[PDB]
Amino acid sequence: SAMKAPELKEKLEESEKLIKELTVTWEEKLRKTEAIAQERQRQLESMGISLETSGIKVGDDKCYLVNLNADPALNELLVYYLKDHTRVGADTSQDIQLFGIGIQPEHCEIDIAADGDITLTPKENARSCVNGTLVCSTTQLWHGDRILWGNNHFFRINLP
Amino acid sequence: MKAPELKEKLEESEKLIKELTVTWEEKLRKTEAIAQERQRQLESMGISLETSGIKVGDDKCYLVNLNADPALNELLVYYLKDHTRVGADTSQDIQLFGIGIQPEHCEIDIAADGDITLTPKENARSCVNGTLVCSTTQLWHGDRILWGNNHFFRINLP
């Protein structure tokens, strides 16, 4: 029974309404999935880290802590990236979370100033050593500095 | 705008719904496959990406670069293959840059039975835990390695 133009136009309107709605839906879904799929790359770029077949490259211009402990606790990283304010301690609030003898809930702070100066500020009752010196003052850090937190948490700062 | 056009376009419209659905599904699947593949690449390297940095599997055999000089051309971490040639030449598996590094400096081998050894080369300084070594030397977890004047490494072994 041949449909005439008003009915055809109505059905076409409904069809294209369906296509538009499907488009919005799949726009949502695709943007979500792509956003999550790009996460690793965004992270690595922010940290200036290149993951190669033969190993790990880090950026010439960013600050890193390298774990020197031969037997680190299960939670610890090998390489920590340092952006501008870094909280080190046992609390969940901390950026670098360490569990060890002598490590306080809030143990120390490492700061990168707008002019590039990197400093370490100790917290109350928290033992930090830089290059074998017990830290009692905000202490400027330099490439190759060795940091000891608590009894046996050794790190090397990397800023070439 | 008139009936014939409208009906042709109506059929086209339905088929089009189906086609766009398949296309979008495909692109979704593709995106997901890419994500999964790179995750697998990381897992195969023995790497975990965390909020504050990089975790490396305890099972992984690798060298940590503690160069007393600034780097710029070296890696911070080198993975060890079964046979790893270390030196200054471009043919080496681990190419290091420094006045005390020889074109062919040393070799580190992982035997089938799991033993790890370092075999030094003539005129190339290799020190293991501070001792100058001249012949094939077994390596153990946590050993300190010095190559040349400045290339301090620590080795991670199971």
Domains in chain B, please, with CATH?
Answer: 1-60 (no CATH), 61-158 (2.60.200.20)
Q: Tell me the two tokens of residue A97.
A: 């979370």
Q: Contact at 8 Å (CB) between A90 and A96?
A: no
**Cα separation, B53 vs B48, whole angstroms:** 9
**Cα separation, B110 vs B81, whole angstroms:** 7
Q: Contact at 8 Å (CB) between A89 and A108?
A: yes
**CB atoms B52 and A81 under 8 Å:** yes
Pairing of strands B83-87, B94-95: parallel
For residue B103, how far is the Cα from the chain centroid?
A: 23
CA-angle at A61, arms to B80 and A113, nearest 5° = 130
User: At A88, phi and psi to the nearest 5?
Assistant: -115, 130
**CB atoms A64 and B76 under 8 Å:** yes
Cβ atoms within 10 Å, residue A61: 9
Choose among B34, B78, B79: nearest Cβ to A37. Answer: B34
**Is residue B4 within 8 angstroms of chain A, CB to CB?**
no
Bridge partner list, B55: B48
From edge to edge, which strands make up the β-sheet containing B94-95? B94-95, B83-87, B106-110, B116-120, B137-138
Bridge partner list, A117: none
| B 29-58 → A contacts, CB under 8 A | 31-32, 34-35, 38-39, 41-42, 45, 47, 49-50, 52-56
**CB atoms B24 and A26 under 8 Å:** yes
**Is residue A17 within 8 angstroms of chain B, CB to CB?**
no
Which contacts of B116-120 are long-range, i.e. CB under 8 A and separated by 24 or more positions?
B116/B61, B116/B80, B116/B140, B116/B155, B116/B157, B118/B145
CA-angle at A101, arms to A99 and A106, nearest 5° = 55
Resolution (A): 1.7
Per the entry, the structure determination technique was: X-ray
**Cα separation, B6 vs B13, whole angstroms:** 10
Choose among B3, B53, B79: nearest Cβ to A47. Answer: B53
Q: Contact at 8 Å (CB) between A139 and A158?
A: no
SS (H, E, C) A9-74: HHHHHHHHHHHHHHHHHHHHHHHHHHHHHCHHHHHHHHHCEEEECCEEEECCCCEEEEECCCCCCC
**Is residue B157 within 8 angstroms of chain A, CB to CB?**
no
**CB atoms B20 and A23 under 8 Å:** yes
Which contacts of A48-51 are long-range, i.e. CB under 8 A and separated by 24 or more positions?
A48/A81, A49/A79, A49/A81, A49/B53, A49/B54, A51/B41, A51/B42, A51/B45, A51/B47
**Residues near B1 by beta carbon (within 8 Å), at least 6 away in sequence:** none
Residues of B in contact with A56 (CB under 8 A): 47, 54, 75-77
**CB atoms B13 and A16 under 8 Å:** yes
**Cα separation, B124 vs B101, whole angstroms:** 7
**Is residue B111 within 8 angstroms of chain A, CB to CB?**
no
**Is residue A94 within 8 angstroms of chain B, CB to CB?**
no
> Which among B141, B146, B145 has a CA at the least distance from the CA of B61?
B141
The four Cα atoms A35, A36, A42, A47 give a dihedral, to 10 degrees, of 150
Element (H, E) at A7: helix A5-37
**Is residue A160 within 8 angstroms of chain B, CB to CB?**
yes
**Is residue B7 within 8 angstroms of chain A, CB to CB?**
yes
**Is residue B10 within 8 angstroms of chain A, CB to CB?**
yes
SS (H, E, C) chain B: CCHHHHHHHHHHHHHHHHHHHHHHHHHHHHHHHHHHHHHHHHHHHCEEEECCEEEECCCCCEEEECCCCCCCCCCCEEECCCEEEEECCCCCCEECCCCCCCCCCEEEEECCCCCEEEEECCCCCEEECCEECCCCEECCCCCEEEECCCEEEEEECC
Interface test with B, best of A20, A27, A39, A79 (most B CBs within 10 A): A79
**Cα separation, A150 vs B56, whole angstroms:** 23
Q: Which residue of A has its CA nearest to B17?
A: A19
Sign of dihedral through CA atoms A68, B129, B59, A40?
positive
Pairing of strands A128-130, A118-122: unpaired
Query: Count of residues for chain B?
Result: 158
Query: Count of residues for chain A?
Result: 160
Choose among A12, A22, A57: nearest Cβ to B10. Answer: A12
Environment class of A58 (CB within 10 Å of its CB; exposed 0-12, middle 13-18, buried 19+):
buried
